[PDB]
Symmetry: C2
Subunit: 28 residues, 2 copies
């Protein structure tokens, strides 16, 4: 469960990184 939770965390962090990149493209 720790490993599975760690992986959900990495996936959410990557989605957060992509969403910020989408915001930057929208603002430019």
């Amino acid at each position: 469960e720790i490993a599975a939770l760690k992986x959900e965390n990495a996936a959410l962090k990557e989605e957060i990184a992509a969403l910020k990149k989408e915001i930057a493209a929208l603002x430019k």
Copy 2:
């Protein structure tokens, strides 16, 4: 560690929800 990981998960999910709300406001 499971509880702490669960909480990081809830915080990331709330940031994802806010970032999508920010994208919707930018697109409108």
